[PDB]
C-alpha cells in the first residue's frame with residue numbers, strides 16, 4: 259500500500275512495480291536460491307511511447323509476470339532490455355523477453371560470462387563499456403562501467419531526467435549488514451569502483467540497489483563500508 263515492497267510481502271512468482279520518479283519505476287520480484295528466498299530489483303524507464311527495461315525479474319515465470327504487470331500498470335510496450343551483469347537475477351528471463359519481441363542487450367563481457375556459466379544470453383552486445391569509467395547512452399539512460407565490484411562485468415544505469423542512479427548488485431541497501439553473494443566479486447577493487455560511481459554521479463537523488471530498499475547517495479558509502487568490513 260505505498261511502502262517499498264519487501265521479501266516476505268511478495269510470493270515467488272508475482273511482481274510489483276514501484277514509482278521512483280516521473281517515467282521511472284523499479285520492479286520487485288522474489289526467487290528461491292539454495293533454499294532461501296530473496297527479493298531483487300530491476301528498473302523500467304519510459305522511452306517516449308515505449309519502455310526500456312533494466313534486468314529481468316529473476317527467472318522465466320517471474321519475467322512473464324513482470325511483462326503482465328507492466329501491461330496492467332503502465333500499458334506501454336517494452337521494446338529493449340539491458341542486463342547489468344551475467345547472473346540469473348539479471349539475465350534469467352531473457353529467453354522469455356526475446357520471445358515476447360523485446361530486444362535484449364548486455365556488454366560483451368556479460369554475454370561471454372553468461373554463456374560460459376549456462377545462463378540465458380542477451381542477443382546484442384553493448385560496445386564502448388570495456389574500460390572502467392566508460393559511459394554510453396542507451397535511450398533515456400546512461401550506462402556506466404565502474405570497474406569490478408559485485409562481478410567483473412557489472413554495469414550501473416543513470417536516468418538523467420530524474421537523477422536516478424540504479425546501482426544494480428554493485429550497490430547494497432542501507433540495512434545490509436553483509437556484502438551479499440560475493441562468489442564472483444572483487445572485494446579489493448569494489449571500493450575503487452564505488453568511488454568512481456560517486457565521482458561520476460554526484461547529483462544522484464535516488465540510489466537503487468540490486469536487492470532491497472532504495473535510498474539516497476549514502477547507499478554508495480555504505481556499500482564501500484560493508485565490502486571493506488567483509489574483506490577485513
Ligand SMILES: C[C@@H](c1cccc2c(-c3ccc4c(c3)CC(=O)N4)c(C(=O)O)[nH]c12)N1C[C@]2(C[C@@H](CN)C2)OC1=O
Nearest residue numbers: 291296345346347408427436437438439441442468469
Ligand atoms: C543469483 C544471485 C544470487 C543468488 C542468491 C542470493 C544473492 C544475493 C544476496 C543479496 C543480498 C543478501 C544476500 C545475498 C544474503 C544476505 O544476507 N543479504 C545476490 C547479490 O548480492 O547481488 N545475488 C544473489 N547469484 C548466484 C551466484 C552466481 C554464483 C554461482 N557459483 C553464486 O552469485 C550471485 O550473485
Ligand SMILES: [Zn+2]
Nearest residue numbers: 343345408427
Ligand atoms: Zn550477481
Ligand SMILES: [Zn+2]
Nearest residue numbers: 347427468469
Ligand atoms: Zn544480485
